[PDB]
Symmetry: C2
Subunit: 207 residues, 2 copies
Amino acid sequence: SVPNKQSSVQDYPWYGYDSYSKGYPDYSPLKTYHNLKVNLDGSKEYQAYCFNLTKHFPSKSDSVRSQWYKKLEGTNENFIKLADKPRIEDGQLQQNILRILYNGYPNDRNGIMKGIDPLNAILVTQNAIWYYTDSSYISDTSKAFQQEETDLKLDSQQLQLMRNALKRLINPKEVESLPNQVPANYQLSIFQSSDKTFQNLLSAEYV
Amino acid sequence: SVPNKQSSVQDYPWYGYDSYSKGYPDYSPLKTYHNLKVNLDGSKEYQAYCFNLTKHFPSKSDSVRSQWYKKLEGTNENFIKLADKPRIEDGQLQQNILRILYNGYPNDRNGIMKGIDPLNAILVTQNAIWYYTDSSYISDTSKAFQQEETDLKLDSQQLQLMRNALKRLINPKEVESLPNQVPANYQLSIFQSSDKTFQNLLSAEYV
Ligand SMILES: [Cl-]
């Protein structure tokens, strides 16, 4: 069921939470999976991804604690204002993030995520997002998800697909060579956390 | 007061927690400070620093949830086994971390932390630790702590001392070219979290 929580914070009406919680299919509290969502007073849930690695993850949906968010335009200016270490040397941060969301979970318009289990696909997408929003270190994708392999007990098939999908998502030249490019109507939103101790969120949708 | 919590997990007797909680002097729940500690059944608290930026921070001391830890030798092999993205290029990972702990808060053996307020000194040390444990991006220290400046309301004096200390701590040349070198009896310990969803910890002491 979709949560219906009304904000107690002026200008922060969006409820941001982790849906990988009790009630989620195959949920385990020992697994490092996440499934971040944003919704407004029990409305349609939007797939969300976090940024600010040194801040707290949004609380699980069954927690007594709730985090409130303000929806902003997903511009470069708003990322510079809210991100700790954005990868802005390519100068198309916003565009890179939009391309990842368009090609990642669940949109997957060019089939980069094909064969990857939903929670593993979210994990790949999130890692590609962190590469841009927090300048997270990714040198060799062939060596990626080593901790996740032991923590989540990923089989060789899933692990190889995940490594290849991450490689493709963080390479702009690779994404730009694909048949389906990001249209003007597919737009980025930044969700600013009311509580500065919690991570900010980001989401994309067709307008 | 020093917490006294007994583990129920075989081989994980250490209690690891964030002491920056209700009751700590000048505590604010809106500040991004941390003061991580490890202790054994109410014994002396040891200053701890976290790693694994994508995992959960240890819970605050006043939480119903407790995280349990196994004390391991602070070797390069144990870092490769538990860290997501360690900065191993120079093969001196363990020595680099030891040098940071020896020179950082509270040890400060070469006075690098002089004039920096305790929570700010922990913050500088933690950021220097993350640079090695998680390959966190630090290009120009002159620009460091921009989000912390607004979130923690740091004055110009503290901010300048913090930026200079970070620069010195992450430069292997600098620290090795200091009058006091890390002695053989100052040893590194890795605290392995029983719950794989939580950050691992690290601490150093004189043996
Ligand atoms: Cl967290």
